[PDB]
Amino acid sequence: ARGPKKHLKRVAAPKHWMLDKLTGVFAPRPSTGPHKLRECLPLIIFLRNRLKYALTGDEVKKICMQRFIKIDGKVRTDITYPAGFMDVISIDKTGENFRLIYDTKGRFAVHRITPEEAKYKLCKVRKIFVGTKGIPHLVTHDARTIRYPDPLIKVNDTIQIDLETGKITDFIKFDTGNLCMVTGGANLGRIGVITNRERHPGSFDVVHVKDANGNSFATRLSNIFVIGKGNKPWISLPRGKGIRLTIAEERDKRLAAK
Amino acid sequence: GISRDNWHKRRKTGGKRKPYHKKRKYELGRPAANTKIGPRRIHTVRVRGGNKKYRALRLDVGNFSWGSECCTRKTRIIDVVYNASNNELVRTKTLVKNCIVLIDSTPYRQWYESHYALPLGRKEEEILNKKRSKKIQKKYDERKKNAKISSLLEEQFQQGKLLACIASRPGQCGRADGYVLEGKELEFYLRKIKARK
């Protein structure tokens, strides 16, 4: 191309959006924002293909232009705003206050949280740098920036910020035994405690995570998101608590529910 | 136009490679600035990203550093005496990033005579032979201890011409900054100039 792409084909879309291949040729290419394109969830396919509030695309913008949708305490009107992990969608008219967290199969679950849980969120510390006059900064997995963070908060740690304030409330260090969620790869959505952070200089670091059944698995350090301190998750986990059943152990769960 | 691609080169083996696309715009090159000495003439080029880089076609005034006192003044360039890259850039008075230049020394004599009260390169009276109060006159006496410039560098102040060196890239930044040659780097370039004579 001579410049940046603007469309997105239907079959070339991300798998976890769960679009179908006979509705149209294209998929909603999400706008540029705080989340990556393969790691986001656009607002139109959340309101239309999950919640059934609208039936077409034009009925989504009739919701959004009436300013009924809030993201992170702020009104967003774009139908392809990239919403992502640990984000809070506040509809607030029906009073629902969603929080996007992956299920155990690796797609965004329609997950409801309590309307005082929607005051805050969690963020992974991606970068620490100082600025002019020696002022430290902090960059999250979202594109937001915090001036004057806590001196103990280092890279890959998880902070808890307040929406509508934008300041740091509390943080969790990346340590052994803390409670984390996997945000990428073949273990997308699984939850367990950190067993061992295996270091490799130059290349990627690998973290072994032990599930709450005895199962263990490993993932790169760039996909590990700490969600709890010790064994206590600081959010409300979805239905299943991040346990990946085998394909036999989810057959009988269907078979013992008929 | 002027392309700075790689695909017009032959391969490592010596095989001629065949082009697979027309020459793209991010592979452009532009003509050299060939910055001379004279009254200031600077052109700006719109470059990739919408940015601007300043290319200077004539420059007479620079910003050079004395180095061993952290004394940087804005002085005037007289001429070019040496160029390691091409001998015929000296004859046409072209200023490039490492060429050895020759500058007026009077901002460096004037600062030195004010910081040490000692004549430099002399065979008005107020800054040198001033009546100082004895607390102030005390302060100039520990500066008097370390006031000795090397013998190769006191020669330069008598002719009023320091031998200097460009450090910036004129024709990219539009300026000519650099530092004064001193020490073993001075006497290396001194005998190269004497050998060409």
């Binding site: 130059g202 | 061993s68 390691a84 780097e185 290396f188």
Partner: protein, 140 residues
């Protein structure tokens, strides 16, 4: 011990020389490669030495035997590998040459010894790697 062979003055651009033994800039590279003694106490100037110059090691780290030592500060190593053919389910010996920058810190390298290289920013038309550790041959 006399380095000034070129038309321009050779100096390490971080060491300020004229201050009122000259000091020697050298850095430590990562990944467990020890900076040799001759890079630390020697006097050579090289902006493409990974220890005393402007080369940062990042990316891949490879190995090969020295075959030619005839360019200035650049040798040719042959890394000799073994390619699989699925139809005949047998292997096939291929090789590949590489021009690699060799620093003066490795004093005596001979034709036929194991050289560990690490890649960096491109240094020439063909040179992308840089010698990090010289391991001699058997009986030497």
């Amino acid at each position: 011990a006399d380095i000034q062979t070129e038309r321009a003055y050779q100096k390490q651009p971080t060491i300020f020389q004229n201050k009122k033994k000259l000091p020697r800039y050298y850095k430590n590279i990562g990944l467990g490669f020890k900076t040799p003694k001759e890079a630390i106490e020697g006097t050579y100037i090289d902006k493409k030495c990974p220890f005393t110059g402007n080369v940062s090691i990042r990316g891949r780290i490879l190995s090969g035997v020295v075959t030619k030592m005839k360019m200035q500060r650049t040798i040719v190593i042959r890394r000799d590998y073994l390619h699989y053919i699925r139809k005949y389910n047998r292997f096939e010996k291929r090789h590949k040459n590489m021009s690699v920058h060799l620093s003066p810190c490795f004093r005596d390298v001979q034709i036929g010894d194991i050289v560990t290289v690490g890649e960096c920013r491109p240094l020439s038309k063909t040179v992308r790697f840089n010698v990090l550790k010289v391991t001699k041959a058997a009986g030497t």
